[PDB]
Design a protein around this ligand. Structure first.
Ligand SMILES: [Mg+2]
Ligand SMILES: [Mg+2]
Ligand SMILES: [Zn+2]
Ligand SMILES: [Zn+2]
Ligand SMILES: [Zn+2]
Ligand SMILES: [Zn+2]
Ligand SMILES: [Zn+2]
Lengths: 46, 455, 73, 98, 392, 49, 51, 117, 49, 67, 275
């Protein structure tokens, strides 16, 4: 299963999902930012 | 539980309480216990410790439980009395122009705990039933304690008014057989006073009944206050045109009088005062004039206040604040000083570059002509900011020094104690006194008394 | 008492012995089971240097020296 | 590394010995509001003894007028010793008298 | 709001208000602070009234329905950071999913919230029972010959979990490598702090105070439109403190909010501020010094004293009660002396020093004194020789 | 007044505080010099005088 | 002589007009965390059994 | 999170009665009603309907604490009429005035007002 | 090359001084942020006069 | 950060009146008249809008609404 | 009972927003209790559950959830037949106890997009829409008329969520206030002296105080009692003003009749023999 990993500015998935070093293909940045969970939460409008 | 706070400066800082569990996360505690712990709910947090056996729970309940901690053996007076709004609300409630109709009296009766069950007959039967404020306060007094006076309120004509035949004047408070006969209650009646109602209650009724008395006074007087109301706005901070004219005129005369004394001084002919240099004679004299100037207009503003000034109502109950504050907000703030003298010459012979060299006038050397209400002028503000530091610094020092003086003192005396043959002896069993305090009495059970035979 | 590695459960041989850090206690799930002389790991505990001047650390009774580069301090 | 070190810890100079008085000179810039920061950058510190001194370098000298804040000083132990620069006040960078 | 770009900032700790407002009564000096651009509080409708005493002595009755409509609500962010240290010769730290079969840790808190890489992802709710990052420290490696293997042998645990912000949601998670070249993360948690009893607030005149209770709109006292106050401050805060400026500001504010132009309050001018303001406020249609006829919420009767009400800019401060509470039954014990912890952050116990001891002495409650200073912090049994007093 | 007219114009026309100092209408004064000046609070007082 | 103790708690104080002179409101969470050891007697046994 | 859930301010608990009656130990023909989860809105009005009655010697209510949803109503009647019946009548009469008020308001709306819907 | 001097933020030698308000917003930097504090090891550090 | 739905003090909805207001000020320099036309009678509802600062506008300008 | 007066009503003025009326010949406790019902006890529908599918906006999620709950909702036709959540047999939600909203927006345009009340859609039939822009031949319609700007979005941001609105009343949360405000006034000339004016000339005269067109200011009468209360109920818009009043009185009737049933329950169960 993928661990996505949107990167800064390029606005695309890094896609890295393994032990290999973090660095976004095409885009020269090396900061990542793990993507939101698909798992549902909930918020009360109170 | 035992409740404490830091810095624990005396035995009444840590006392037993019974817990009662509530929602939200702060320790909520009775308002009256504020003065023994020196607490303020401006973000001061306090500490609790729980006993873990019946044995320590027994020991706490009997010795350190709060209601027993009412009258401190330091100076045989109440450690805790009716404070803040309730204290102001009691004065306002006891004035004999206060009348209550059947509906409100029943609600106040309803908030009272140890109520007899019988409803008192209203002091006014017709046209419609009304109970006076004194009358409902009189249900709150436990059993039948007694005390004349114990007011020393501003009221009347000290030293010669009560002798002016006693046109009851209503000022002086008299209670008899557990019923308030006349007068108005204040901090001197209800506070930490030597002869307050609260002190007498502890003695006559016993500590448990006195605690019910504190609760009673507060829930009931407090509930009334809610319908009556209290406040302070700009309407409680201004006086009339004529007083305002009188204040400026008193100040304009005094300033001319200072210029006059400066004119005499420069002539070289002032004639000095005993044991002083001529500047000191001069400085002592201008200081006398400016102080007299503040006090004259201060006495003018207190006169000029109307009956309805809420500000005067807080000052008179003795709840918070005082006569000098009225002086400063309404009248004129006066000479500032630092180290007990007028604002020093910081620059060459001057306080600020805004003045002339050597200018002994009032304003130029630290007299504030304005009131807080009109606002301070720029120099006065900075000389006022200088008067502000001496107090902030004094605070930071005194806390360190006294913390040290107290620890050293306790550390000496700790092992002294009264033995079972009642001679007071220390650790190596040497005798300190043959009888404790030279009579073998307790400090919390003594009272001030008059010796008839010195007549 | 040498036979441990975390085992002393009276009625049954141990399967697990969870550490309830907040209570300061050692718990044995399938019964009731405290057994503990608790240490949350002495290295967090001595660390009571805090509000007092910490930039200089007067409490540092233990220098690091970095031994894993060397051997003999 | 030497500049990196001194500026980070807040110490000063040799560390082995020189650090007795000129300690606490760099600080993490407080960022709680916008004002804390402007006020923090515009702070100034008088050095002093520590733990019990009572004298005149704590009260508000007249010459601070137009220079340092009237009222704006820590409500705590170091009252009047760490001061804050007034609103218009300025500081010379200095240059050759030649 | 403390700077604009806060959202892309992993500041280790921060507080932001939902709705800031610039102040109604402002000083000209404030233009050059840009305090308009990033203000620190809200224009409250305040009444300086006594009421039910829940505002006695430096507390306030605050309007609960206003806090429902988001009054002074704020968001709280804590960024936790963790490093993957290589740490020399024969050990290693690793970001991964800790299991009780493979590592030396087994702390009671739940590991399930974690992802399979050891680090949670934004949006999942966390609490003091949760682990945010699964770090493990491989150590011995195998330096214990012969099959002292069994399980959990390879590595100790030391992963980081929530002490403090014992509830909230993960705002952001960031994975990168820092200046050593190590894998580094910062993970940010968002919490929302509703103004409650025990939050410290302060107006602009140096009168700080705690929120003593909150009443719902129904109960506050009211007037005209029924513009119920968002706060009731006690009258006693003014007289001995003479903070008259505080009292002029409502009055200047009343004219400014009503006339519709932000009011001047710069310290030194000839704007005859007390009189000139009182005259303007009356021309508009109020008692010229601001008093209004109030009614109580409990019975609707009028309150016999007219009450001074109007707006004042107030501050909610960084001192909030849920961070400040504390307690301990039995806890971690430091084996320097084996008495309770001092790091409150790590479930400490409060001190009972020489002065508190000195009062128990002064009460004469010796049994409670031995208890606090012995059985309830530090009891021990030792055997001594009767011939000589050495514990050897 | 002409200097003020330049400051209002500064919203598009080139001008600076430095220009204002170069006019010699404003000066910088340190605390040691401030001991010897005769500094007046407001134009009001200096005119009404 | 100045020991850290167990069974200790600290929070902010806020005023409360309804307490008696010696009562103290205690947060429910602090009340749940701190315990007292009652010893079982053949009278409260049914009450303690409920707890 | 030491704050109570907001519904608890008004929702009745399954282990508590809506009303409880206890006799006074001091004076005769007095009674004490405990009303659970009901604030000044109900309490203040029932106090007034009891005061309206000419045979009530005493009527009052107290909500013991802000944080605890509960009020008490104490009533004392003449040595002939029972306090329970006075309470029964007080609500029933109150029901009657409010019904008549609702009727009179609705008919008043029935006036040729053109924005009724 | 002899060493690395810590720059102080937005001073004449820190690249932020040259860019305009739109550019600075483009670099995710606050336009109102005052600068004049060093950045060390992630922490923003200010030197006290 | 954008004007709140409903004024704190009482409840009268107020976010809806923000866009309208910037239009009125552009048309007329009459803050009194602007607030009046929007119907913001009592001043609690008025302080709400009069004292708001719309930080959102500067905040939106960063390119990365993507993280 | 013979001593009940049965009051009196007069409607002075009615609009789409305000309802302004006078109640006469009644008790203050009635007036005050009825004013309190108008706030707390009158039920309505507002968003109560928000589920956030995707949120790339510059506002944090709980902030979106807050703004969104607080937005007003028409309820008049449906607030009655709807049942309370806890009372409803269903697990979670159902068509019979709640109504569902859906919001989906993305900024694909170069100009900043606003997210508004119209963009929020009721999966439930258009019996219960948002307040603004529906069957609105409305002169209150001005410029955008979005009723509320839930957020703003620059090119690239998107927002997808679900919401479940539920019936509840103001005592439980302020989002359920059915009023913009509630004016209440009685005895305008201060005949009864419930307040005591210091220098009475310094106070103005309300629109109800004209009866003394003169400047004599407050003639006293001690034999009087509070009579003739003036109201002005103002609609938040989510429930029309008269419906607020009629639902308040009925709810108060329901609450009272229920207390009578429990008091009856005391005489039926555990026979009233205690006192
Ligand atoms: Mg204090
Ligand atoms: Mg105090
Ligand atoms: Zn990239
Ligand atoms: Zn076991
Ligand atoms: Zn031996
Ligand atoms: Zn409003
Ligand atoms: Zn359902």
């Amino acid at each position: 299963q993928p661990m996505i990993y949107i990167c800064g500015e390029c606005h695309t998935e890094n896609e890295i999902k393994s032990r290999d070093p973090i660095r976004c293909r095409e885009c020269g940045y090396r900061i990542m930012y793990k993507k939101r969970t698909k798992r549902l939460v909930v918020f009360d409008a109170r | 539980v035992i409740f404490n706070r830091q810095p624990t400066l005396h035995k009444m800082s840590m006392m037993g309480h019974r817990v009662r569990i509530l929602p939200w996360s702060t320790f909520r505690l009775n308002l009256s216990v504020t003065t023994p712990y020196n607490a303020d709910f401006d973000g001061d947090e306090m500490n609790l410790h729980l006993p873990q056996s019946l044995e320590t729970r027994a020991e706490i309940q009997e010795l350190a439980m709060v209601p027993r901690m009412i009258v401190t053996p330091q100076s045989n007076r109440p450690v805790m009395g009716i404070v803040q709004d309730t204290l102001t609300a009691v004065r306002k409630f006891t004035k004999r122009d206060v009348f209550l109709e059947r509906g409100e009296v029943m609600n106040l009766l309803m908030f009272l705990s140890t109520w007899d069950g019988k409803v008192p007959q209203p002091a006014i039967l017709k046209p419609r039933p009304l109970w006076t404020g004194k009358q409902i306060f009189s249900l709150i007094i436990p059993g039948h304690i007694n005390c004349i006076r114990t007011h020393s309120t501003h009221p009347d004509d000290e030293d010669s008014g009560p002798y002016k035949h006693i046109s009851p004047g209503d000022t002086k408070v008299v209670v008899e057989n557990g019923e308030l006969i006349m007068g108005i209650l204040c901090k001197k009646s209800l506070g930490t006073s030597a002869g307050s109602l609260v002190h007498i209650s502890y003695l006559e009724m016993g500590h448990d009944i006195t605690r019910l008395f504190y609760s009673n006074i507060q829930t009931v007087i407090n509930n009334w206050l809610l319908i009556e109301g209290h406040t302070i706005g700009i309407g409680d901070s201004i006086a009339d045109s004529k007083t305002y004219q009188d204040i400026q005129n008193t100040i304009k005369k005094a300033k001319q009088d200072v210029i006059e004394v400066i004119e005499k001084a420069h002539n070289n002919e002032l004639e000095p005062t005993p044991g002083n240099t001529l500047r000191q004679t001069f400085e002592n004299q201008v200081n006398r004039i400016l102080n007299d100037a503040r006090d004259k207009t201060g006495s003018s503003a207190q006169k000029s206040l109307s009956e309805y000034n809420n500000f005067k109502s807080m000052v008179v109950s003795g709840a918070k604040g005082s006569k000098i504050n009225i002086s400063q907000v309404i009248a004129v703030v006066g000479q500032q000083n630092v180290e007990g003298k007028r604002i020093p010459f910081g620059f060459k012979h001057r306080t600020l570059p805004h003045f002339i060299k050597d200018d002994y006038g009032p304003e130029s050397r630290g007299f504030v002509e304005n009131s807080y209400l009109a606002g301070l002028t720029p120099t006065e503000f900075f000389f006022h900011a200088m008067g502000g530091r001496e107090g902030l610094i004094d605070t930071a020092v005194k806390t360190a020094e006294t913390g040290y003086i107290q620890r050293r003192l306790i550390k000496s005396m700790e092992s002294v104690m009264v033995k079972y043959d009642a001679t007071v002896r220390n650790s190596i069993n040497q005798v300190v006194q043959l009888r404790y305090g030279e009579d073998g009495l307790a400090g919390e059970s003594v009272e001030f008394q008059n010796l008839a035979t010195l007549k | 008492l040498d036979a441990l590695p975390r085992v002393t459960c009276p009625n049954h041989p141990d399967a697990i012995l969870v550490e309830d850090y907040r209570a300061g206690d050692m718990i044995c799930p399938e019964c009731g089971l405290v057994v503990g002389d608790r240490v949350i790991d002495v290295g967090s505990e001595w660390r009571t240097f805090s509000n007092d001047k910490a930039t200089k650390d007067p409490s540092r009774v233990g220098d690091s020296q970095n031994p894993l580069l060397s051997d003999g301090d | 590394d030497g500049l990196k070190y001194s500026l980070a810890t807040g110490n000063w100079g040799d560390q082995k010995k020189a650090h007795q008085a000129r300690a606490g000179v760099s600080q993490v810039l407080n960022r709680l509001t916008f004002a804390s920061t402007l006020s923090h950058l515009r702070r100034l510190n008088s050095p002093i003894g520590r733990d019990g001194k009572l004298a005149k370098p704590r009260q508000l000298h007249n010459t601070l007028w137009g220079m340092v804040c009237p009222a704006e000083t820590p409500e705590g132990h170091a009252v009047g010793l760490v001061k804050n620069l007034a609103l218009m006040a300025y500081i010379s960078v200095g240059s050759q008298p030649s | 709001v403390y700077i604009t770009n806060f959202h892309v900032r992993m500041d280790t700790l921060a507080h932001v208000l939902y709705y800031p407002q610039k102040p109604l009564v402002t000083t000209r000096s404030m233009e050059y602070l840009r305090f308009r651009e990033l203000p620190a509080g809200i224009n409250s409708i305040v009444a300086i009234a006594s009421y039910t005493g829940y505002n006695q002595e430096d507390s306030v009755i605050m309007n609960r329905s206003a806090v429902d409509r988001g009054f002074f609500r704020s968001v709280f962010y804590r960024s936790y950071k963790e490093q993957e240290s290589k740490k020399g010769f024969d050990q290693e730290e690793v970001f991964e999913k800790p299991t009780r079969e493979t590592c030396q840790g087994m702390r009671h808190a739940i590991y399930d919230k974690l992802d399979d890489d050891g680090l949670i992802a934004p949006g999942v709710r966390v609490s003091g029972d949760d682990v945010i990052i699964g770090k493990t420290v491989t150590l011995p490696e195998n330096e214990d010959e012969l099959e002292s293997t069994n399980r959990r042998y390879t590595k100790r645990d030391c992963s980081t979990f929530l002490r403090t912000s014992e509830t909230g949601i993960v705002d952001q998670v960031m994975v990168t490598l820092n200046q050593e070249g190590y894998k580094f993360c910062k993970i940010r948690v968002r919490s929302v702090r509703i103004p409650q009893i025990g939050d410290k607030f302060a107006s602009r005149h140096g009168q700080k105070g705690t929120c003593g209770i909150q009443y719902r709109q129904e109960d506050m006292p009211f007037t005209c439109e029924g513009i119920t106050p968002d706060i009731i401050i006690n009258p006693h805060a003014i007289p001995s403190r003479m903070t008259i400026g505080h009292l002029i500001e409502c009055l200047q504010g009343k004219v400014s909010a009503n006339k519709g132009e932000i009011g001047d309050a710069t310290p030194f001018n000839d704007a005859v501020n007390v009189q000139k303001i009182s005259n303007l406020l009356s021309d508009y249609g109020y008692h010229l010094r601001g008093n209004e006829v109030l009614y109580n919420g409990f019975t609707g009767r009028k309150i016999t004293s007219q009450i001074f009400i109007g707006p004042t800019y107030y501050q909610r401060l960084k001192h909030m009660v849920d961070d400040k509470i504390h307690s301990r039954a039995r806890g971690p014990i430091q084996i320097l002396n084996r008495q309770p912890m001092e790091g409150r952050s790590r479930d400490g116990g409060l001190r009972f020093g020489e002065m508190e001891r000195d009062c128990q002495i002064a009460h004469g409650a010796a049994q409670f004194l031995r208890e606090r200073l012995f059985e309830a912090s530090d009891p021990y049994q030792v055997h001594v020789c009767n011939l000589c007093g050495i514990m050897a | 007044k002409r200097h003020i007219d330049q400051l209002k114009e500064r919203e598009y026309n080139n001008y600076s505080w430095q220009d204002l100092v170069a006019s010699g209408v404003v000066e910088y004064i340190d605390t040691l010099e401030e001991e010897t000046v005769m500094l007046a609070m407001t134009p009001d007082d200096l005119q009404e005088k | 002589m100045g020991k850290r103790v167990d069974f200790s708690a600290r929070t902010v104080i806020t005023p409360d007009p309804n307490l008696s002179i010696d009562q103290v409101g205690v947060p429910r969470s602090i009340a749940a965390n701190m315990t007292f050891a009652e010893i079982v007697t053949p009278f409260n046994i049914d009450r303690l059994q409920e707890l | 999170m030491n704050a109570p859930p907001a519904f608890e301010s008004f929702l009745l608990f399954e282990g508590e009665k809506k009303i409880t009656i206890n006799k006074d130990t001091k004076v005769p023909n007095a009674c004490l009603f405990t009303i659970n989860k009901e604030d000044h809105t109900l309490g203040n009005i029932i106090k007034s309907q009891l005061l309206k009655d000419p045979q009530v010697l005493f009527a009052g209510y107290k909500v013991p604490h802000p944080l605890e949803h509960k009020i008490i109503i104490r009533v004392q009647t003449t040595p002939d009429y029972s306090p329970q019946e006075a309470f029964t009548n007080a609500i029933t009469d109150l029901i009657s005035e409010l019904s008549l008020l609702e009727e009179r308001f609705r008919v008043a709306i029935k006036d040729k007002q053109e924005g009724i819907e | 090359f002899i060493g690395k001097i810590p720059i102080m933020l937005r001073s004449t030698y820190c690249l932020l001084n040259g860019l305009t308000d739109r550019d600075l917003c483009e670099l995710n930097e606050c336009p109102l942020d005052p600068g004049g504090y060093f950045i060390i090891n992630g922490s923003e550090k200010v030197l006290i006069a | 950060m954008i004007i709140p739905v409903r004024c704190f003090t009482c409840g009268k909805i107020v976010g809806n009146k923000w866009e309208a207001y910037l239009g009125l000020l552009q048309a007329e320099y009459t803050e009194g008249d602007a607030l009046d036309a929007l119907g913001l009678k009592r001043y609690c509802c008025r302080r709400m809008l009069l004292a708001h600062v719309d930080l959102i506008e500067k905040l939106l300008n960063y390119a990365p609404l993507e993280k | 009972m013979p001593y009940a007066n049965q009051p009196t009503v007069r409607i002075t003025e009615l609009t789409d927003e305000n309802v302004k009326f006078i109640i006469e010949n009644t008790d203050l406790a009635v007036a005050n209790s009825i004013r309190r019902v108008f706030i707390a006890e009158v039920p309505i529908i507002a968003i109560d559950w928000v589920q956030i599918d995707a949120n790339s906006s510059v506002l944090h999620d709980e902030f979106i959830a807050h703004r969104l709950g607080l937005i007003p909702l028409i309820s008049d036709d449906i607030v009655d037949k709807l049942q309370y959540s806890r009372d409803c047999t269903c697990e979670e939600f159902c068509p019979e106890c709640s109504v569902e909203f859906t919001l989906d927006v993305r900024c694909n345009e170069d100009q900043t997009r606003h997210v508004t009340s119209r963009d929020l859609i009721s999966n439930s039939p258009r019996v219960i829409p948002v307040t603004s822009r529906n069957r609105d031949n409305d002169p209150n319609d001005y410029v955008e008329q979005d009723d509320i700007l839930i957020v703003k979005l620059r090119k690239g941001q998107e927002l997808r969520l679900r919401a479940y609105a539920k019936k509840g009343f103001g005592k439980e949360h302020a989002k359920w206030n059915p009023t913009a405000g509630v004016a209440f006034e009685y005895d305008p000339d201060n005949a009864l002296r419930h307040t005591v004016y210091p220098k009475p000339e310094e106070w103005p005269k309300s629109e109800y105080s004209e009866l003394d067109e003169d400047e004599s200011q407050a003639p006293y009468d001690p034999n009087g009692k509070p009579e003739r209360f003036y109201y002005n109920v103002e609609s938040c818009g989510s429930l029309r003003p008269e419906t607020i009043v009629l639902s308040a009185l009925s709810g108060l009737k329901k609450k009272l009749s229920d207390l009578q049933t429990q008091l009856s329950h005391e005489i039926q169960s555990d026979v009233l023999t205690i006192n």
